Paper text:
Each KHK-A monomer consists of two domains. The central α/β domain comprises a nine-stranded β-sheet flanked on each side by five α-helices, resembling the conserved Rossman-like fold. A four-stranded β-sheet extends from the central α/β fold to form the lid domain. The protruding β-sheets of each monomer are packed and oriented orthogonally to each other. Additionally, a central bend in strand β3 wraps around and interacts with strand β7 of the other monomer.
Fructolysis is not robustly regulated and is initiated by ketohexokinase (KHK). KHK catalyzes the phosphorylation of the C1 hydroxyl of fructose to generate fructose-1-phosphate (F-1P). Kinases in the pfkB family, which also includes ribokinase (RK) and adenosine kinase, are characterized by two structural elements: a large central α/β domain where the active site is located and a small lid domain that covers it upon substrate binding and catalysis.
Numbering used by the authors:
A (entry chain C): -3 to 298
B (entry chain B), D (entry chain A): 3 to 298
C (entry chain D): -2 to 298
Write the structure that this text describes.
Amino acid sequence: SGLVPRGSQILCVGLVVLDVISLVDKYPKEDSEIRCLSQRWQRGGNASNSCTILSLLGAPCAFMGSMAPGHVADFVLDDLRRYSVDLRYTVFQTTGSVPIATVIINEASGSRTILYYDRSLPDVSATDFEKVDLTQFKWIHIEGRNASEQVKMLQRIDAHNTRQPPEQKIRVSVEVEKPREELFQLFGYGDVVFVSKDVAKHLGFQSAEEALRGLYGRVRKGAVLVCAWAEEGADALGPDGKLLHSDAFPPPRVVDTLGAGDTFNASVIFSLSQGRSVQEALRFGCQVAGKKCGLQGFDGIV
Amino acid sequence: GSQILCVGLVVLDVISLVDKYPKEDSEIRCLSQRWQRGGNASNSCTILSLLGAPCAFMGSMAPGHVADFVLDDLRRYSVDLRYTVFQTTGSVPIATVIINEASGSRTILYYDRSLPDVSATDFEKVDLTQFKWIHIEGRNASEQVKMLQRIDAHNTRQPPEQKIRVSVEVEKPREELFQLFGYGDVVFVSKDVAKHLGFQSAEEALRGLYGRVRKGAVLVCAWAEEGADALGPDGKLLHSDAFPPPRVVDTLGAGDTFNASVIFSLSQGRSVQEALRFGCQVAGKKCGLQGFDGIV
Amino acid sequence: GLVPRGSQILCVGLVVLDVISLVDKYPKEDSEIRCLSQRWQRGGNASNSCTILSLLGAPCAFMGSMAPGHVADFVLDDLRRYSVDLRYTVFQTTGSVPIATVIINEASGSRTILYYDRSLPDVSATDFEKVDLTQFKWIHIEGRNASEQVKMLQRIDAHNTRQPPEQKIRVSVEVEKPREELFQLFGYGDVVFVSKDVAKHLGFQSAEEALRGLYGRVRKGAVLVCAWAEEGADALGPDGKLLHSDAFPPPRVVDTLGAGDTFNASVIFSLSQGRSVQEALRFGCQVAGKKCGLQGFDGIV
Amino acid sequence: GSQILCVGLVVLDVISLVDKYPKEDSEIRCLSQRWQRGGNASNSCTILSLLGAPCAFMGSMAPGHVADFVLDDLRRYSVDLRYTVFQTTGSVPIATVIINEASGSRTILYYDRSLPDVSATDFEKVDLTQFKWIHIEGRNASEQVKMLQRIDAHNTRQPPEQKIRVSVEVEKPREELFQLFGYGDVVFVSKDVAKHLGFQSAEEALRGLYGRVRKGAVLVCAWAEEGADALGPDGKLLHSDAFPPPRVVDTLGAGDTFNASVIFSLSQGRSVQEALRFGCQVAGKKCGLQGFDGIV
């Protein structure tokens, strides 16, 4: 079958989530009873979905995430296997369970409304990451969660990199998606930093451009800051000071926006990993994300 | 001859408790999440059981995890499983229930999985001598009319003390159920049905629908914070006020609770007036608690 | 549709996961041998009884403890395949389904069982109290937790005091493992099965001796049955007359796992059909003999 | 260049512990039962990890539940997973192991599930600069010869102090494994292979087979309760007696424990005599313990 060659995979570190998805014909009225058009299970979590898209795009990838044995684990693991995502670095846990997101998708508009049920699964630790043999990966993408622990991980990778020739340097990306103050440290790590519109608004920014000019001072020297802003497309700012923008590329009809953000992030990583410019990565990300929005789930993108 | 039979649906309720109703396109954290056996007739068995009346659930099931959960839960409440009917296609339906803990509202996204209904032919095999009361949740009305006629015919051969009392619930607003009004000693009509039919109060609905019941029958309409009313053959409109709890936290199955409490009270020989008061009392208590257990 | 009254045979007892290794020769201690094959098969005396009953065409139900999980999904899936009624499964919040590691020697068809208990709570008398008896014409109880099973047997007897003859429930008990608490069960049921292993453990050299020596312990009117593998089986009832059937050996004996369950279930079937004790004995030997020439159970029919 | 790589099999050991060895056709109750990650190279990493030596497992796995257990366990011992090779056909082999707690004996019913082996093409991708020692469990000899030739060629460009040390285990009496004797710094031959070659002691086996090893190589043969012997280039036969525990409860993986401990000792720069003694000491200790953890 083949040993995985050095420096050949993209690693994504973060959460797996079970999405239990109900499609409805209009957004439910409070205290009413509505009939589901359909209902399905779908693997989710930001880093988990990134691997789906990377895979679909034809990038070898690996997922590192906590896991608990069980029926839900069986489903998300089996799904991860379907997309040939390398799972050697799954971290099994003896307490807690995989979280469940109950997702209401309104077919009127493609909107998605998420009721998140946390089930106490322990996060991947810095001492878990210490065990990872870095020779396997050309790019490591980290979904911000437990900051002080992830900082140690990012520090580990930077230290590896001080010992590597240019062909063997590991590119790093970070996602700051949840509006929690402890994630603010993460801006100062990584070659590419993704900040969400949600965090941007919570941090007092009115636009993507304002967010990027406002937060660029927090990134490490040389970093590219990326902020996606839904129907207003996506922007980026790198060390040259030039604000880059892509318009959104909506499909003719929006039916399912769940994981559109992850589709953007993964598409930007793919494009950059393939040696495209940041400008090109931005447009590709918005194009792939918009195509996804016209489809149920992820498969029809390729 | 001492059991109460409840014929209807069983539903898996997958319940999420939230601090406010979710805005569309937002992500909110659940305070908690639980599985709960539901369905109208199924919930009625739960309350009867808690009140101390031996009961049996008659309804369709399918093999698998969901049915195993609901069967186990039925067992925990000592609900007699003799008349469960295992179907070879379809699956137990699943209600995703959002309970807003700000108000106790329950919003239900219902996912049907094509489970066949129990038929008149299934009902023909039921041993009617086991039951003092049979309650039918309106579902497949042409078949259920045949069940009701079976009970009626049975009752023509019984002395007074051996007569099986019958209640019917019309709880979904589907016209095919109108037929069912014409059977039973007690007929329950839901506020939701009443409102869909154009009615704006319990008394308005009772006066608007009493034409449809058979001679001697009592029509009953519960109206949430407005208590419950009843109208019987003497023409006297009866009412109980509600019994709201200190805070309403969970109104899922409150109407089932009311119906079961009324059946319990009536099956025990109480007046329709006392039956309304007790249904209002128990259902109001239920609304102040998660699930059903704390009612007793 | 709805199961008619008095129509099913209920079997109360254990479900077990059998993990079966087929080997060309019985392994020598401290050696390493290659498995010819390896399979998962649902087992447990009461569980296996239902398989045979379903195969013979008798509507049946299984009541035993179950713990959610993978092993449960395997045995539950397999129970459903034979259309066994599962409404009286007693799911438990502790413990797991036991695993029996079984070595089958292809040279002889012997079965050696390494049994691993996984602390699953047993079906209790309170559990049994909830069973609506109107569904069943025959109840078979695999002896396990005897003081609780005696209450179940007492409940069935009381039920029967209120039934016309068409509605009387017939009862069998199995004493298969040589454990002291079980021997109390000899005194209940219309039909009492005692294994060759138990007989030998109590110091009896033959099916005849075991039946003479144990008959004083059964209740008035009962039939005591003791199968003796390749020597056939015996039965003894109130008339003091020992009945026998010789074994019906297969061309080659390839798998004897569940032969005893096959026997028991086929006797129950034949009796439940109104056959004589002599005929049920014969038929039990006939079906268990056939099973011994086949891997698993499906080939009996 | 500080890790030890162990190339060979992982096997799932499904272990039943009993108080007596089973009589054929009987039924016996297990004292206990457990899964243990096994296989010669896999066990080697467990021991190296416990002794304090950073190591890596190279070997085939198939995605699925069993691999998840194996990877988790490897994770727990901090064994580097980089050179695990995922196969798209076959599955991890399963060894059903009966351990008689009265003697500590282990009887193995092996179920092979057709897992493709690690190839020399896989080995070509290994970063040799990561490792100071490489241990190869003899299996697919023509492929492993190519691996050993690759290591030899790498060593021709290293100075004395950056040379990769190499061990080979010949554990099966298969004629194809004999060519592996000519490779490596340390060659392990089991008591079983030795007896099959007609040797009646470790001393006879060493004398009889030393001619098959390359110039300067050390040949080692463990003889269980009789200890272990070695022979190197000076021609001096070395021996250590066994170190039996108070009682022998579990001898599964005792050969792997010996080999790994010898490798460890030698990797730390100890004499061959000291390494023999240490391997006997650790292996002896293991045999008095269920599994591996209690050795340190």
